[PDB]
Amino acid sequence: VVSHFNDCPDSHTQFCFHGTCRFLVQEDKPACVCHSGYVGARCEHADLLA
C-alpha cells in the first residue's frame, strides 16, 4: 500500500530481455513479468527451450 512503481529501468531492468518491467521504487525491488510464447525466468529464449 502507498508503495508503487513507475520508473522501471534502473539497471536491474537488464534482467528482462522480453517481458514486462516493473520496479517498486518506494521499495526498490525489481520485478519483471513474462509476456507470452516464451520460456525461462528472464524470458530471454522464445519457445524451443522447454
Side-chain angles (χ1 to χ4, degrees):
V1 286
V2 342
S3 61
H4 60 254
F5 42 78
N6 272 109
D7 321 74
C8 118
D10 292 296
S11 323
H12 304 87
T13 173
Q14 187 55 257
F15 280 67
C16 344
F17 171 77
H18 181 92
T20 342
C21 173
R22 328 178 185 173
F23 193 91
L24 193 49
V25 172
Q26 283 178 77
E27 305 182 80
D28 294 71
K29 277 195 184 296
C32 278
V33 184
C34 215
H35 270 16
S36 174
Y38 250 70
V39 233
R42 294 176 62 193
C43 313
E44 290 173 294
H45 226 108
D47 68 78
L48 200 80
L49 217 302

